[PDB]
Amino acid sequence: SGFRKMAFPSGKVEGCMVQVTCGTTTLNGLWLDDVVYCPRHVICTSEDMLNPNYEDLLIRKSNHNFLVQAGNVQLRVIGHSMQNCVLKLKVDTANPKTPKYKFVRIQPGQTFSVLACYNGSPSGVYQCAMRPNFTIKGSFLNGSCGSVGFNIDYDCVSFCYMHHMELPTGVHAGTDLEGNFYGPFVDRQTAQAAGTDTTITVNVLAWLYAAVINGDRWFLNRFTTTLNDFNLVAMKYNYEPLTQDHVDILGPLSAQTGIAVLDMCASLKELLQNGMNGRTILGSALLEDEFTPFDVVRQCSGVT
Amino acid sequence: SGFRKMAFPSGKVEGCMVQVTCGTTTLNGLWLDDVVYCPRHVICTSEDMLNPNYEDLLIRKSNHNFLVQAGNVQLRVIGHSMQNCVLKLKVDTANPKTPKYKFVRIQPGQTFSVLACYNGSPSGVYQCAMRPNFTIKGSFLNGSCGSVGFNIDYDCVSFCYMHHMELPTGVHAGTDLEGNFYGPFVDRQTAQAAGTDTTITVNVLAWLYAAVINGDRWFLNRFTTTLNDFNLVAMKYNYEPLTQDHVDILGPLSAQTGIAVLDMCASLKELLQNGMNGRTILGSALLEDEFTPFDVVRQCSGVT
Numbered sequence: 001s002g003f004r005k006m007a008f009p010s011g012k013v014e015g016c017m018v019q020v021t022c023g024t025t026t027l028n029g030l031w032l033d034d035v036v037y038c039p040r041h042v043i044c045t046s047e048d049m050l051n052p053n054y055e056d057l058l059i060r061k062s063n064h065n066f067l068v069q070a071g072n073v074q075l076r077v078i079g080h081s082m083q084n085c086v087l088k089l090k091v092d093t094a095n096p097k098t099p100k101y102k103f104v105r106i107q108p109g110q111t112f113s114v115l116a117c118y119n120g121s122p123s124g125v126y127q128c129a130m131r132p133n134f135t136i137k138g139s140f141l142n143g144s145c146g147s148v149g150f151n152i153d154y155d156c157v158s159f160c161y162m163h164h165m166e167l168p169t170g171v172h173a174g175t176d177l178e179g180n181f182y183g184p185f186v187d188r189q190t191a192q193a194a195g196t197d198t199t200i201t202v203n204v205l206a207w208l209y210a211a212v213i214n215g216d217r218w219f220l221n222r223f224t225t226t227l228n229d230f231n232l233v234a235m236k237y238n239y240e241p242l243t244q245d246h247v248d249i250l251g252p253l254s255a256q257t258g259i260a261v262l263d264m265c266a267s268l269k270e271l272l273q274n275g276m277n278g279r280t281i282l283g284s285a286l287l288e289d290e291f292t293p294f295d296v297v298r299q300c301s302g303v304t
Numbered sequence: 305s306g307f308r309k310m311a312f313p314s315g316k317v318e319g320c321m322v323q324v325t326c327g328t329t330t331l332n333g334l335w336l337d338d339v340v341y342c343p344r345h346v347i348c349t350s351e352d353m354l355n356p357n358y359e360d361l362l363i364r365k366s367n368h369n370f371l372v373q374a375g376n377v378q379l380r381v382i383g384h385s386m387q388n389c390v391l392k393l394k395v396d397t398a399n400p401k402t403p404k405y406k407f408v409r410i411q412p413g414q415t416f417s418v419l420a421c422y423n424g425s426p427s428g429v430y431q432c433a434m435r436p437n438f439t440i441k442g443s444f445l446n447g448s449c450g451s452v453g454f455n456i457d458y459d460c461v462s463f464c465y466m467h468h469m470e471l472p473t474g475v476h477a478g479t480d481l482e483g484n485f486y487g488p489f490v491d492r493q494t495a496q497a498a499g500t501d502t503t504i505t506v507n508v509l510a511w512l513y514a515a516v517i518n519g520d521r522w523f524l525n526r527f528t529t530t531l532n533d534f535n536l537v538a539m540k541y542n543y544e545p546l547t548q549d550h551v552d553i554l555g556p557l558s559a560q561t562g563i564a565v566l567d568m569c570a571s572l573k574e575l576l577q578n579g580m581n582g583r584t585i586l587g588s589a590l591l592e593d594e595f596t597p598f599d600v601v602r603q604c605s606g607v608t
């Protein structure tokens with residue numbers, strides 16, 4: 001028992017982290033096969049971050065201007081191209097540590113692990129969720145760009161995120177591995193405000209199920225509700241509307257605990273209206289929303 | 305910016321996880337050089353867990369009874385010995401992935417990362433702290449025994465914990481890599497109750513510093529206090545007494561923020577007496593105590 005904010009083992013991703021330097025800018029790159037992926041803003045100086053014309057800036061760069069270093073050894077750049085907001089640097093050597101991988105574009109509410117890196121070296125791993133406003137609440141400092149978000153299914157790494165920037169409000173924005181930003185963010189130092197950071201309702205319910213499975217049952221009540229009645233309460237509290245798809249996704253947790261999804265919804269409804277009253281659930285004093293129903297099943301079953 | 309419960313990259317430890325089977329019991333082992341470390345209770349059947357005589361149980365086991373499997377290949381056991389509550393299985397092959405390592409016995413309040421494993425395969429990584437009552441609040445299921453806790457200093461892994469058991473209250477107990485349990489726990493299925501789980505005061509102050517460094521300053525007040533006055537409040541709230549050693553350890557954070565340690569102590573004192581009033585600090589509704597002052601400095605500086 002015990003429920004923790006658990007990240008995937010980072011080994012397979014550590015073997016892919018490289019350092020990319022273009023001029024005076026140094027950030028992280030992801031080396032898969034003979035291609036190194038990195039944010040295109042590596043070609044930017046501090047000056048042109050305000051209004052960069054990436055295509056124009058790119059014309060002044062040749063293969064030899066991108067310095068790729070894996071560990072203490074240098075990789076030879078034999079080609080370069082810009083795909084949306086990422087640069088793909090073809091190197092002459094396939095990464096011997098390339099795991100089985102896929103590039104996936106995740107939906108908001110989905111969780112992933114981040115391997116925070118600086119100068120191609122990994123410093124930490126934590127679990128995140130793509131917020132409904134397409135930002136991530138990460139822990140990234142200058143030089144962390146190019147650090148990646150991923151999920152692992154047995155031996156296949158699904159890369160879903162690459163860090164590009166910190167918005168003026170301290171939240172983070174990035175792209176999928178095809179270079180498309182999540183949300184409406186752009187790789188420019190401009191006024192970019194995030195939308196409402198709503199709570200991921202399906203994840204809160206999943207975490208309430210995890211709490212029941214681990215012994216924290218005080219919040220269980222004698223009530224039930226309907227999807228529409230629940231959603232009126234969720235709207236008031238800036239919670240994402242709960243759909244029948246979410247109810248279906250919660251099915252296995254509902255089955256294991258014997259607590260119908262709508263009954264857990266009424267427990268959640270009372271927690272929203274009454275608060276925790278100084279109590280805790282799974283060691284937290286607020287309703288945790290960065291565990292999907294799949295994470296609860298996986299953690300509670302011990303999927304390796 | 306952004307502050308996350310961050311674990312060390314788990315790569316170096318993943319390369320050391322092996323499966324150990326003795327009879328019908330299967331748990332995790334740690335393979336360093338030509339020795340595999342694992343909980344001695346691997347020799348136990350479900351029956352003898354109530355009152356095991358490990359020395360006697362061990363006499364019935366030979367080298368060939370311990371099956372060690374690293375990945376899909378079997379390791380040859382050429383020797384076995386019991387050191388306190390761990391078994392050391394000498395194998396004929398040195399682990400080619402053995403990183404630079406040390407075995408350390410940590411003090412309560414110290415934090416570490418855990419690589420949760422099942423059948424020698426890693427499933428997740430999370431950050432923990434050794435509680436002042438010598439338990440850890442982990443996330444471990446049956447088969448997780450032998451999973452390890454560690455810290456990394458650049459390229460040297462300091463192993464500090466090995467999981468052995470879950471107490472009837474859902475908390476976890478284990479040993480250092482010399483087999484000595486943290487706390488008064490024994491590897492027996494008997495009534496073992498944990499002591500008071502006091503809050504790690506120095507870690508809460510470190511986390512308040514991290515909050516100030518990241519922009520959360522609402523809890524800062526116009527007051528100061530003394531170590532003795534603070535400690536009277538800390539005693540009331542089951543917080544660990546704060547010493548001049550802790551004040552010294554908080555020095556770098558105090559210097560970076562310009563907030564004297566005793567002033568942060570008065571902020572903490574008011575947070576204890578008044579509560580959060582429905583507010584949050586670094587996304588948490590309670591005072592976080594599983595970041596040491598060293599973790600705050602490291603995370604905030606980007607040590608790789």
Ligand SMILES: *CCC(=O)N(c1cc(C(C)(C)C)[nH]n1)[C@@H](C(=O)Nc1c(C)cccc1CC)c1cccnc1
Pocket residue numbers: 027041044049140141142143144145146164165166167168187188189190305
């Ligand atoms: C890896 C580069 C870097 O550290 N940052 C960065 C990104 C950019 C763009 C994408 C605009 C070219 N410029 N610099 C920062 C960052 O995003 N800095 C920043 C902040 C903190 C607030 C508002 C605007 C900007 C853009 C300059 C960075 C710092 C911490 C975490 N991630 C990225």
Ligand SMILES: *CCC(=O)N(c1cc(C(C)(C)C)[nH]n1)[C@@H](C(=O)Nc1c(C)cccc1CC)c1cccnc1
Pocket residue numbers: 001331345348353444445446447448449450468469470471472491492493494
């Ligand atoms: C790896 C073996 C295992 O899963 N567990 C275990 C440990 C033991 C001892 C050390 C007593 C021989 N026996 N079984 C359990 C565990 O500790 N089980 C348990 C629980 C859950 C509560 C009270 C007593 C016991 C001891 C039998 C385990 C389960 C989850 C996490 N860690 C360990």
